[PDB]
Motif scaffolding. Structure first.
Motif, PDB file in Angstrom:
ATOM      1  N   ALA A  71       0.817  -1.208   0.000  1.00 15.28           N
ATOM      2  CA  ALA A  71       0.000   0.000   0.000  1.00 15.28           C
ATOM      3  C   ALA A  71       0.854   1.263   0.000  1.00 15.28           C
ATOM      4  CB  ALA A  71      -0.941  -0.005   1.201  1.00 15.28           C
ATOM      5  N   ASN A 114       1.746   1.733  -3.343  1.00 18.42           N
ATOM      6  CA  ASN A 114       0.505   1.911  -4.088  1.00 18.42           C
ATOM      7  C   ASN A 114       0.062   3.369  -4.068  1.00 18.42           C
ATOM      8  OD1 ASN A 114      -1.984   1.571  -5.355  1.00 18.42           O
ATOM      9  ND2 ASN A 114      -2.567  -0.198  -4.108  1.00 18.42           N
ATOM     10  N   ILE A 115       0.045   3.985  -2.884  1.00 16.35           N
ATOM     11  CA  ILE A 115      -0.410   5.368  -2.766  1.00 16.35           C
ATOM     12  C   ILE A 115       0.614   6.323  -3.368  1.00 16.35           C
ATOM     13  CG2 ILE A 115      -1.014   7.178  -1.130  1.00 16.35           C
ATOM     14  CD1 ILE A 115      -1.870   4.635   0.700  1.00 16.35           C
ATOM     15  N   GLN A 160       2.788   6.604  -5.953  1.00 16.43           N
ATOM     16  CA  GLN A 160       3.137   5.993  -7.234  1.00 16.43           C
ATOM     17  C   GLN A 160       4.532   6.407  -7.691  1.00 16.43           C
ATOM     18  OE1 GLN A 160       1.484   3.737  -9.110  1.00 16.43           O
ATOM     19  NE2 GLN A 160      -0.085   3.542  -7.518  1.00 16.43           N
ATOM     20  N   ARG A 161       4.721   7.696  -7.963  1.00 16.09           N
ATOM     21  CA  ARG A 161       6.025   8.215  -8.341  1.00 16.09           C
ATOM     22  C   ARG A 161       6.437   9.433  -7.528  1.00 16.09           C
ATOM     23  NH1 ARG A 161       6.084   8.784 -14.838  1.00 16.09           N
ATOM     24  NH2 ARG A 161       3.867   9.219 -14.470  1.00 16.09           N
TER      25      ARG A 161
END
Ligand code: SF4
Ligand code: SF4
Ligand code: SF4
Ligand code: FES
Ligand code: FES
Ligand SMILES: [Ca+2]
Lengths: 148, 905, 156
Positions: B416, B419-420, B422-423
């Motif tokens: 997660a 996931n949150i 991203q970049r």
């Protein structure tokens, strides 16, 4: 739909902009799972994710993302056009709506028919599928695809 | 939070998952895919425990203890029949396709899968069908690859990609045909690939250098030591067998190098096992070469030393604090010379002044991973101080960690976390003469000469606080980039400034100090980090002395007719011709070293010193932390002719024989007390490790495991009478298994990790107060100095813009991880890994010279017309020539120097 | 020896336009290369990693994960016959035996000239008209083993 003012910028003049895309998959069975669908949509391997966090908060690219079946999205416009209490007045069952049911596999007439909830499985086999074929008997059945 | 395991009430940390919550208390749950540093992914499904939500609950639910938070009021059962049967079934499923390879496996007795196969009590095989097999890839000189032993626990891909940042290791395959490796064959080009031999629970990724001369874990004789290959000072566990250093393992330090080493420090140990090394004292009469033992060598050396008017000593930043102090007290305070050159010593003194006088708290390596915005000025960290680069990567991913924690996601849900985030990542601004290995995550990379990097730092310092000295003449595009860096650093909460003496300039360190001072003046918790060159550079700078130029001019002028060179090759900090002339001019050269240096032809006496595996001492890392490294083995146990002693012992016995004509082999505690008596500012090294009288309930600490084998036969070829085992009078350890190595002993120096039922590197979980945190009863090593009450002023001497002069070529340093260390390049395993020596040129300057890549260009520096093939560097600025430092014939002192006569030949 | 052509590169970039991550166009990039070249060769992985900027290990994992992203050379036409449960009740084994008798190969192997590559596939989503078979872009339903030789002559 994009040409006739239904997809793109300023749909009908409300002020809502929506872009629709078709992402053709590469043929893996696990891609149907919602978190694995999100993973494969982002170009990664289709491994499913842990829930919680559910996709409704942190889904595709960490953004709020809702994954729905085709039949649910085909069910919604009838609700939005013909009302809610009409949709609740289709069948006298706890699961409201109409489901696309049908029997398949060595039956007389395999096919697809839209039936309300609560119709018994013998009716789909007899009234629609016609029962077993010539010289065949019935041994078993499986309601919801291979994973049932 | 309060949990209940089998009716027992435990107080736990509620922000943690249940797996290491139970592992902290000493409760055994089998696990494969979870790691304390990587996180939880819930892959191996081995950590199942039966959870109840009420105190009266019969059924429960089999939940993942690595994926369930340890909240207040969870009643979990581990030893329940259902959970135990499921864990045994998971072990069985992992054992269906596992090969019959345990005797011929390099991790036999070091295998996590073996410990979890015996832990679940699975010994009966009812699987009767075939087993899947896989081919193997050639991963380079370091990693041996055996994919048949894999269990698809995804630790390698997780560490190598989400932690190390590497790009060449990945997961491929299918349902059960999962492969873990490269898309082709070739060397793993990450600088942290060596930790895969301990991250992997099975014998897939193994140490090939250890696999050459292989022995089992119980056959190893271990010791706690400090890695000598650069200035970071990561704690290691050297383990030897049959008189040669076999394998460097990671040693847990919760403040420095918790779970990960780098490849230079892990595979660079091959110089210790060289046969060219001096093992006896050798004396020359003209061309005649004789061998002495210790006493006659000491007496003759004292006679020749007494027959000279002034004895001078040239120390080294490679040698320990005690040996350099012994040389200093042997030759006198005023006649002690540091082996570094004038520029390197000036940069080292400036770095020490900023550290222990600048008023800015320099963080440890574990503390770096929490800083927000990182500015690296000049220092090429990934090829010099690589572990700091890994911690920089962690601090960069801290932003995604912060956004994940803001969304009520627990810290162990690493999936997660990426996931949150991203970049999005924290700002990293690196400056170098070329492209770095940190460019994949850096917010900006500045490719410029050291003058322009220093001017960029001065511009940042001025644009933060207007009292800082301003530089005028910046282009508006570079001014906009300056403003971007200023907005990123000023808006952060824990800025970090990383510089060092490897940039080759002084103004870079001055600019970094000014940036840190400007960040401190705005009210921010700013930290600074100078990366030195050698392991004990900081201690040599703290002790001090003259430069190598002064020692060479004392030798050349004739005022020094006797020179003692302690652990120095002297060609790394000065030209070979001048050193050879100053050594042939001097009528007595005494080289005390453990390596066959090039100056030993000029040496009238050669004293066989001991390396880190055979000597005890103290080394000061780049953050001022004194750390004691211990002896692994006695070299004279197997080869009884070997007279190979500690360098401080050599110099102290020589001093005693010079004074009172008696030979007195001292103890390490006496030399430590002498250092902390004569030098007030080195007083903290007494607290680095306890003395030789330290006992755990009366007994010493064991250097070898309790199941050490072949005591009565490993020396039976020489003599059937097994001699007395060597006695360690210097330290608290003993060369035997009659010692204490329990995980609950009140000590900080741990030679190796072993617990009953825990043979893997995962046995370090028992040696900590909480799993993944600090070591139990504190981490070893103490800081020499604290943060000062007030700091330095603004360094006003800004440099000028780099204008390329015609004819003269400024030498841009291109440090490599494999080849820029003095001792690591001597390892035979690094010769198949280090790149070929290429001189790096701009495309414009190469087109001006007419040279293409591949052709040879000859360059002359002090009468040495040496030819090198040409590589083209687009990122290098015009007017410079890129040279690799630490190579054969190219010293690190060449950085910043000019280079005339650069023609195609 | 690989080099992306103009059409493949422009289509790849247009697929990057659809998402907010260049990584998300990796599957369609591999599908574009498979459509153009018949399969995805070894240099195509590194070329796609160069144009998207993602590591080549990620492209290799995506390419080897999915079944219809071919990583080995195939014939002129790829036969994908359904082997799932509904076609098993409908008797896909007769069609498999007919194809094995005609092409004289095994499922997974290619003929010596390189005409047909026979492969099992998952459910084709047409189980009410089982058994089915998916040649390169054409699906065939209500199959019989005797119609296999007449079916295979429409692909030279
Ligand atoms: S990895 Fe472990 S279980 Fe596998 S063969 Fe080696 S020692 Fe045995
Ligand atoms: S190679 Fe090792 S670390 Fe990687 S998944 Fe397999 S067992 Fe785990
Ligand atoms: S970073 Fe330096 S001290 Fe640490 S293992 Fe590598 S070479 Fe040794
Ligand atoms: S340790 Fe929890 S599933 Fe692997
Ligand atoms: S089972 Fe064959 S088409 Fe669905
Ligand atoms: Ca000793």
């Amino acid at each position: 739909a994009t040409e006739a003012g239904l997809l793109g910028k300023n749909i009908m003049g409300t002020g809502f902009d929506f872009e629709l895309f078709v992402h053709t998959g590469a043929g893996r069975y696990i891609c149907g799972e919602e978190t694995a669908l999100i993973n494969s949509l982002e170009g990664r391997r289709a491994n499913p994710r842990s829930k919680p966090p559910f996709p409704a908060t942190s889904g595709a690219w960490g953004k709020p993302t809702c994954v729905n079946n085709v039949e649910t999205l085909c069910n919604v416009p009838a609700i939005l056009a013909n009302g809610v209490e009409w949709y609740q007045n289709i069948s006298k069952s706890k699961d409201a709506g109409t489901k696309l049911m049908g029997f398949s596999g060595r039956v007389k007439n395999p096919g697809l028919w839209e039936l309300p909830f609560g119709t018994t499985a013998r009716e789909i086999l007899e009234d629609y599928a016609g029962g077993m074929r010539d010289g065949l008997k019935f041994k078993a059945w499986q309601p919801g695809g291979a994973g049932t | 939070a309060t949990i209940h395991v089998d009716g027992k009430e435990y107080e736990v940390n509620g922000a943690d998952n249940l797996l290491e919550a139970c592992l902290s208390l000493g409760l055994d749950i089998p696990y494969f895919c979870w790691h304390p540093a990587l996180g939880s992914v819930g892959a191996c499904r081995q950590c199942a425990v039966k959870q109840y939500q009420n105190a009266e609950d019969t059924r429960g639910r089999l939940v993942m203890s690595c994926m369930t938070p340890a909240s207040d009021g969870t009643f979990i059962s581990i030893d329940d029949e259902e959970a135990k049967q499921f864990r045994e079934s998971v072990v069985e499923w992992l054992m269906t396709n596992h090969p019959h390879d345990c005797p011929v496996c390099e991790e036999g007795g070091n295998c996590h899968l073996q410990d979890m196969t015996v832990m679940t009590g699975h010994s009966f095989r009812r699987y009767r069908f075939t087993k899947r097999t896989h081919r193997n890839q050639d991963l380079g000189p370091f990693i041996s690859h055996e994919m048949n032993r894999c269990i698809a626990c995804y630790r390698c891909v997780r560490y190598y990609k989400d932690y190390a940042g590497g790009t060449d290791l990945g997961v491929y395959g299918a349902h059960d045909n999962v492969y873990f490796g490269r898309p082709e064959d070739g060397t793993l080009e990450s600088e942290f690939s060596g930790n895969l031999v301990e991250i992997c629970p099975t014998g897939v990724f193994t140490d090939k250098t250890h696999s050459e001369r292989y022995n089992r874990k119980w056959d190893m004789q271990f010791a706690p030591s400090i890695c000598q290959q650069c200035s970071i000072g990561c704690n290691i566990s050297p383990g030897e067998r049959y008189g040669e250093l076999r394998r460097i393992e990671n040693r847990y330090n919760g403040t420095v190098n918790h779970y990960f080493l780098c490849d230079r420090g892990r595979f660079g140990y091959g110089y210790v096992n060289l046969k060219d090394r001096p093992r006896q004292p050798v004396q020359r009469r003209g061309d005649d070469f004789i061998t002495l033992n210790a006493e006659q060598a000491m007496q003759g050396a004292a006679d020749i030393l007494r027959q000279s008017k002034k004895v001078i000593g040239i120390g080294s930043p490679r040698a320990s604090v005690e040996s350099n102090f012994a040389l200093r007290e042997l030759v006198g305070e005023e006649n002690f010379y540091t082996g570094i050159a004038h520029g390197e010593q000036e940069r080292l003194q400036l770095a020490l002044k900023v550290l222990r006088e600048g008023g800015i708290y320099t963080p440890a390596l574990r503390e770096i991973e929490s800083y927000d915005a990182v500015l690296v000025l000049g220092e090429d960290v990934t090829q010099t101080g690589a572990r700091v680069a890994l911690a920089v990567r962690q601090a960069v991913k801290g932003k995604a960690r912060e956004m994940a924690a803001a969304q009520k996601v627990a810290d162990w849900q690493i999936a997660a976390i990426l996931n949150i985030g991203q970049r999005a990542k924290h700002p990293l601004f690196v400056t170098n003469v070329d492209d770095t290995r940190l460019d994949d995550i850096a917010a900006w990379t500045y490719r410029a000469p050291v003058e322009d990097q220093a001017r960029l730092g001065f511009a940042i310092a001025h644009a933060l606080d207007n009292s800082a000295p301003a530089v005028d003449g910046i282009e508006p595009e570079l001014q906009s980039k300056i403003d971007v860096i200023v907005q990123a650093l000023a808006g952060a909460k824990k800025p970090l400034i990383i510089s060092g003496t490897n940039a080759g300039s002084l103004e870079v360190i001055q600019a970094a100090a000014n940036v840190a001072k400007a960040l401190k003046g705005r009210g921010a918790d700013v930290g600074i980090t100078m990366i030195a060159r050698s392991v004990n550079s900081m201690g040599l700078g703290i002790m001090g002395g003259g430069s190598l130029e002064e020692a060479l001019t004392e030798l050349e002028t004739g005022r020094a007719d006797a020179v003692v060179v302690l652990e120095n090759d002297l060609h790394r900090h000065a030209s070979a011709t001048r050193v050879n002339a100053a050594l042939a001019k001097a009528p007595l050269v005494m080289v005390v070293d453990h390596q066959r240096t090039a100056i030993m032809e000029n040496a009238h006496l050669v004293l066989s010193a001991a390396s880190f595996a055979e000597s005890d001492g103290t080394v000061i890392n780049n953050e001022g932390r004194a750390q004691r490294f211990f002896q692994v083995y006695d070299p004279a146990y197997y080869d009884s002719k070997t007279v190979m002693l500690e360098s401080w012992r050599w110099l102290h016995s020589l001093h005693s024989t010079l004074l009172s004509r008696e030979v007195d082999w001292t103890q390490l505690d006496h030399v430590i007390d002498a250092v902390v008596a004569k030098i007030p500012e080195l007083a903290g090294i007494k607290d680095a490790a306890p003395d030789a009288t330290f006992r755990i309930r009366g007994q010493k600490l064991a250097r070898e495991p309790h199941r050490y084998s072949g005591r009565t036969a490993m020396r039976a070829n020489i003599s059937v009478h097994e001699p007395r085992q060597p006695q360690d009078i210097d330290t608290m350890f003993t060369f035997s298994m009659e010692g204490n190595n329990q995980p609950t002993a009140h000590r900080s120096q741990v030679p190796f990790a072993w617990a009953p039922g825990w043979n893997s590197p995962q046995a370090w979980n028992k040696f900590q107060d909480e799993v993944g945190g600090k070591l139990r009863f504190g981490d070893p090593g103490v800081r020499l100095f604290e943060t000062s009450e007030n700091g330095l002023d603004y360094f006003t001497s800004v440099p000028a813009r780099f204008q390329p002069q015609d004819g003269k070529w400024r030498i841009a340093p291109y440090y490599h991880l494999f080849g820029s260390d003095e001792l690591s390049q001597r390892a035979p395993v690094f010769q198949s890994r280090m790149p070929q020596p290429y001189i790096k040129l701009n495309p414009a300057d190469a087109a001006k010279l007419g040279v293409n890549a591949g052709t040879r260009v000859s360059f002359s520096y002090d009468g040495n017309t040496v030819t090198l093939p040409v590589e083209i560097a687009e990122g290098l600025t015009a007017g410079q020539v890129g040279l690799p430092m630490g190579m054969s014939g190219i010293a690190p002192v060449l950085a910043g120097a000019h280079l005339e006569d650069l023609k195609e030949a | 020896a690989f080099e992306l052509s103009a059409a493949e590169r422009e289509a790849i970039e247009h697929e990057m336009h659809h998402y907010e991550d260049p990584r998300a166009a990796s599957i369609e990039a591999l599908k574009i290369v498979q459509k153009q070249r018949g399969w995805v060769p070894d240099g195509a992985i590194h070329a796609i990693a160069d144009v998207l900027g993602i590591p080549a290990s990620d492209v290799e994992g995506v390419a080897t994960f999915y079944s219809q992203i071919f990583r080995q050379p195939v014939g002129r036409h790829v036969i994908r016959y359904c082997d799932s449960v509904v076609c098993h009740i409908n008797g896909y084994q007769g069609i498999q035996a007919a194809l094995e008798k005609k092409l004289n190969i095994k499922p997974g192997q290619t003929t010596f000239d390189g005409r047909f590559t026979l492969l099992p596939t998952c459910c084709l989503g047409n189980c009410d008209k089982g058994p089915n078979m998916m040649i390169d872009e054409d699906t065939h339903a209500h199959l019989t083993p005797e119609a296999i030789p007449e079916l295979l002559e429409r692909y030279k």
